[PDB]
């Protein structure tokens, strides 16, 4: 009935006034930490050692500027992020005087700052969060090496920054936008400063701050119980941002207040979110929504956390090892200078070496996984990068994920939630019915990364004679589209109901079939009835896609445009026997696509290489823009994606009122695929594939049923009970302090 696991290996330690360190470990545990660094955590200690040796080799490049105009001129999370790694190094290797002196210098440069806000982001506290949590961690880690002056002066800096963060929690979106990455980030910085002040006897301020952090976070964790698939609606990259602070919260609040969250249902599914979103080769992730090529923070820290405290079977350590060993050193996917060392110290503290690295049993078997809250299907994740080991992904779901969408729309948690005002979906993309395809582990159709929220920056459709007048000429896309130059009045109403849906998803005898429905992402006034997308993976190097657009009889649409992206390589035109197509050149050969509507006509595509506006952190993207005339009421188009190993020799498509047939002959096999117009819940199948001699039926079994998840019972009481846990800790500290004044 509860989200507690009493067996978790985090002892509730009772507080001791003016004892340091205390945050993550005590002084008596340092000796074991040093033993670990030399014996069983050597591979993590070595990452810390190389980070610090890098800083020591160029100290003036890495030290925060004394000059406040230089300190605050740029996004400056690198200061606090790198300080955490440096401070942990000084704990493990106290005999390195040069590193301890650099850490003192580093902290002095930060403590001299009049402000930890970035110059032209006055209303954004995240840079203050990074500086504060790193500074306060270093303060705790290094307390006994500091002078008395530094011990006092640095404490005042922590109190000032923490007090400012507390005051802004009542005046900013992050104080009430639950499960948005800003909220655990800013909360954790406040809690860390609060624990440092609590330990030093400043109980009046630390009580207010602690009570405020727990109230916000405990509410979000109750809401998080409804996310049944372990995912986060902001994607893998921003999700790693969230979990960096969420996992710190769960650890610290248990160690210091005995608030136990380690039986949480979302937490025990979360491994799937990092195991099933990783592409062949363990370097990249599916990169849905605002994302880089993989993760923002960690994820080795979060993975060893899951193994020590949740799974206790060695597959978290195993996945962390795969990612650690395959990380890119230069070029796309390289972790940024600002984020790359941020979680090294918690990875060191949370790694349990007694759980030997053991892969999940299905490792090496291409597996289909459906995230029923996120609305994302993936296939072939976490494979070795090999010929015929392919990745496939598809997204069609509810804005915010099912839990957030349903909470808002059925008015759940009335005491806490008053609509979308309590959630923040600004990092999502107009991307429903999008897909990606990485045959042989070579990215072919990819996501375009962090960028402007334009529909055509995702692998989806736009439609041609818009009723409204937006940007994008007469083209209209999905209802979450934003020109970010003008937001329409009351269009938020239709954006607030954006919704795709995965209708079917099954793997059967090496063939994958996925159907999605995208009507719910487009304005109802275009009288679209069905925006249907069908994926059929006939072979690891042969993917067939069929779109079916059913127009209502009123609708004014005349044309559709489908977009297909590759973020790293531009597309080149091609045509064979009147079949238009595109290809990209990769080192292992050419990857090709060909298309035609079901009358046999294929139009030549338009090609574009786009940068991104100044302020986004990645170059841009390249896409094909395939247009098709909307034939009659029902229109259907087939696209075919080929890896270099396969030689397609016929590609014919013929259909009628109820059926469409796609025939594909290669030099080694023949493939037929039959799809039917209408829905198939109850009276016939979705698709039938005839490979060489095998008959493959995708019937009502592959259908995906929808569920409401029930409101957590007694949700207000859950939060209230947990808020009682920290009061006796404050009371005991007070008694210890009074005990000492008397003596
Ligand atoms: C460490 O702990 C993590 C976290 O729980 C595990 O992660 C899971 O890994 C598996 C794949 O290895 C994921 O897939 C699921 O596996 C289940 C199998 O579990 C074991 O027990 C069954 C018997 O109950 C054995 O037959 C099997 O060999 C396994 O040893 C399946 O039951 C799941 O679904 C199956 O049934 C459904 C319904 O019929 C089908 O649709 C599926 O196709 C499948 O047949 C599923 O396959 C699982 O999702 C992972 N969980 C999470 C949360 O990520 C690690 O595997 C574990 N590592 C080690 C070393 O044990
Ligand atoms: C995708 O390609 C289509 C066709 O080339 C583009 O549509 C044309 O855009 C121009 C300029 O915006 C208009 O003058 C034409 O009238 C459009 N044609 C039709 C049939 O509507 C479209 O702009 C492209 N979209 C993107 C995002 O690249
Ligand atoms: C903290 O803020 C107060 C003003 O509220 C200021 O007087 C004091 O000097 C500040 N201390 C530090 C170390 O920044
Ligand atoms: C594009 O990305 C490359 C790295 O792959 C980088 O070197 C280059 O500077 C980027 N383009 C621009 C205009 O900065
Ligand atoms: Mn996208």
Given a contact cutoff of 8 angstroms between Cβ atoms, the answer to whether 300 and 320 are in contact is yes
Q: Is 238 in the pocket of ligand 2 (CB under 6 A)?
A: no
Q: Is 334 in the pocket of ligand 4 (CB under 6 A)?
A: no
Q: Are strands 559-566 and 461-463 parallel, antiparallel or unpaired?
A: antiparallel
State the Cα torsion 371-374-380-382 to the nearest 10°.
-100
Residues facing residue 564 across a β-bridge: 624
**Catalytic choice (41, 130, 180, 182):** 182
Given a contact cutoff of 8 angstroms between Cβ atoms, the answer to whether 610 and 588 are in contact is no
Whole-angstrom distance, CA of residue 591 vs CA of residue 471: 33
Q: Are strands 461-463 and 501-508 parallel, antiparallel or unpaired?
A: unpaired
The one-character DSSP state at 116 is: -
CA of 449 to the centre of ligand 4 (A): 14
20 is catalytic: no
Query: E strands, 360-460, where?
Result: 368-371, 376-379, 391-395, 434-438
CA of 147 to the centre of ligand 3 (A): 20
182 is catalytic: yes
Burial class, 244, CB count within 10 angstroms (exposed 0-12 / middle 13-18 / buried 19+): buried
Whole-angstrom distance, CA of residue 730 vs CA of residue 28: 23
- Provide the 3-class DSSP secondary structure of residue 638: strand
* Sheet bearing 368-371, strands edge to edge: 368-371, 376-379, 391-395, 434-438
Smallest CA-to-CA distance from 600 within 642, 557, 663 is with: 663
Residue with CA closest to ligand 2 atom 13: 473
Smallest CA-to-CA distance from 245 within 179, 165, 327, 312 is with: 179
Q: Is the peptide bond before 390 cis (omega within 30 degrees of 0)?
A: no
Neighbours of 202 (CB within 10 A): 17
Specify the ligand 1 atom closest to the Cα of 275: 54
The HSE-up count of residue 309 (CA atoms within 13 Å, CB side) is: 29
Whole-angstrom distance, CA of residue 604 vs CA of residue 582: 9
Specify the ligand 2 atom closest to the Cα of 561: 1
* Structure tokens given for 723: 């808020």
* CB-based contacts of 543, cutoff 8 Å, min separation 6: 392, 437, 439, 535, 536, 537, 640, 641
Task: Answer yes or no: is 458 a known binding residue.
Answer: yes
Given a contact cutoff of 8 angstroms between Cβ atoms, the answer to whether 607 and 566 are in contact is no
Smallest CA-to-CA distance from 582 within 458, 451, 444, 712 is with: 444
Query: Which technique?
Result: X-ray
Residues facing residue 676 across a β-bridge: 659
Residue with CA closest to ligand 3 atom 6: 160
715 is catalytic: no
Q: Is 174 in the pocket of ligand 2 (CB under 6 A)?
A: no
Residue with CA closest to ligand 2 atom 1: 625
CA of 697 to the centre of ligand 1 (A): 25
Task: Answer yes or no: is 447 a known binding residue.
Answer: yes
* Structure tokens given for 583: 């290809």
Taking CA atoms, 522 is separated from 360, 377, 403, in Å, by 40, 21, 21
What is the CA angle 140-145-148, rounded to 5?
Answer: 90
Given a contact cutoff of 8 angstroms between Cβ atoms, the answer to whether 266 and 3 are in contact is no
Whole-angstrom distance, CA of residue 203 vs CA of residue 197: 7
Taking CA atoms, 518 is separated from 354, 460, 534, 547, 700, in Å, by 48, 9, 11, 11, 20
Q: Is 54 in the pocket of ligand 2 (CB under 6 A)?
A: no
Smallest CA-to-CA distance from 674 within 542, 522, 564, 536 is with: 536
Q: Are strands 376-379 and 391-395 parallel, antiparallel or unpaired?
A: antiparallel
Q: Is 621 in the pocket of ligand 2 (CB under 6 A)?
A: no
């Amino acid at each position: 009935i509860t989200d507690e696991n009493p067996e978790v290996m985090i002892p509730f330690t009772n507080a001791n006034y003016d004892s340091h360190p205390m945050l993550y470990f005590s002084r008596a545990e340092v000796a074991e930490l040093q033993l670990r660094a030399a014996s069983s955590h050597e591979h993590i200690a070595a990452r810390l050692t190389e980070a610090v040796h890098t800083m020591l080799s160029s100290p003036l490049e890495y030290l925060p500027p004394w000059d406040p105009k230089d300190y605050s001129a740029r996004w400056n999370e690198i200061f606090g992020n790198n300080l955490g790694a440096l401070a942990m190094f000084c704990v493990l290797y106290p005999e390195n005087i040069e590193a301890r002196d650099m850490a003192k210098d580093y902290m002095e440069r930060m403590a001299a700052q009049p402000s930890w806000l970035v110059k032209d982001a006055p209303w954004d506290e995240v840079p203050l969060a990074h500086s504060l949590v790193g500074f306060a961690t270093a303060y705790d880690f290094l307390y006994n090496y500091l002078s008395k002056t530094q011990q006092e002066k640095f404490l005042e800096v922590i109190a000032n920054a923490s007090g400012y963060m507390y005051e802004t929690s009542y005046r900013r979106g992050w104080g009430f936008q639950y499960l948005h990455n800003h909220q655990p980030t800013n909360c954790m910085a406040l809690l860390t400063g609060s624990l440092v002040l609590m330990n030093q006897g400043y109980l009046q301020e630390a009580y207010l701050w602690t009570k405020q952090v727990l109230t916000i976070m405990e509410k979000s964790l109750v809401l998080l119980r409804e996310v049944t698939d372990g995912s986060l609606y902001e994607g893998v990259a921003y999700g790693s941002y969230t979990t960096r602070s969420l996992f710190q919260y769960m650890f610290l609040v248990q160690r210091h207040f005995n608030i136990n969250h380690f039986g949480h249902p979302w937490l025990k599914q979360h491994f799937a979110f990092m195991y099933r979103t990783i592409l062949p080769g363990f370097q990249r992730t599916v990169a849905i929504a605002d994302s880089n090529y993989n993760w923002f923070y960690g994820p080795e820290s979060q993975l060893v956390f899951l193994d020590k405290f949740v799974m206790r079977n060695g597959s978290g350590n195993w996945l962390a090892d795969q990612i650690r060993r395959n990380r890119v050193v230069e070029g796309p996917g390289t972790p940024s200078k600002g984020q790359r060392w941020c979680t090294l110290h918690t990875e060191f503290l949370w790694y349990d070496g007694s759980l030997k690295s053991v892969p999940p049993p299905d490792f090496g078997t291409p597996t289909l996984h459906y995230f029923e809250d996120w609305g994302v299907v993936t296939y072939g994740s976490a494979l070795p990068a090999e010929i015929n080991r392919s990745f496939l992904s598809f997204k069609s779901g509810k804005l915010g994920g099912r839990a957030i969408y349903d909470i808002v729309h059925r008015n759940k948690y009335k005491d806490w939630i008053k609509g979308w005002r309590n959630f923040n979906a600004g990092h999502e993309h107009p991307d429903q019915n999008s897909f990606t395809f990485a045959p042989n582990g070579v990215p072919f159709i990819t996501e375009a990364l962090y960028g402007p929220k334009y529909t055509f920056f995702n692998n989806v459709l736009m439609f041609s004679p818009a009723v409204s007048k937006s940007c994008f000429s007469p083209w209209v896309g999905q209802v979450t589209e934003d020109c970010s130059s003008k937001w329409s009045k009351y269009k938020h109403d239709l954006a607030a109901s954006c919704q795709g849906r995965v209708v079917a998803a099954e793997e059967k005898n090496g063939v994958v079939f996925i159907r999605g429905e995208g009507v719910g992402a487009y304005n109802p006034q275009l009288n679209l009835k069905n925006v249907q997308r069908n994926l059929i993976l006939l072979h690891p190097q042969l993917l067939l896609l069929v779109d079916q657009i059913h127009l209502g009889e009123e609708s004014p649409l005349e044309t559709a445009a489908s977009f297909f992206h590759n973020v790293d390589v531009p597309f080149e035109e091609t045509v064979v026997d009147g079949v238009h197509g595109a290809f990209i050149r990769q080192r292992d050969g050419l990857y090709k696509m060909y298309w035609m509507d079901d009358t046999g006509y294929s139009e030549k595509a338009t090609f574009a290489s786009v940068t991104y506006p100044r302020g986004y952190p990645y170059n841009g993207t390249n896409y094909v823009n395939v247009t098709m005339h909307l034939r009659s009421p029902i229109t259907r188009a087939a696209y075919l994606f080929i890896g270099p190993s396969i030689d397609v020799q016929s590609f014919t498509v013929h259909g009628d009122s109820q059926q469409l047939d796609v025939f594909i002959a290669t030099s080694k096999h023949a493939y037929a695929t039959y799809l039917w117009t209408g829905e198939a819940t109850g009276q016939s199948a979705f698709a039938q594939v005839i490979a060489d001699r095998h008959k493959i039926l995708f019937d009502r079994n592959s259908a995906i049923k929808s569920s409401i998840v029930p409101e957590v019972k007694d949700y207000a009481a859950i939060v209230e009970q947990n808020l009682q846990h920290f009061k006796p800790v404050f009371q005991l500290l007070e008694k210890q302090i009074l005990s000492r004044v008397r003596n």
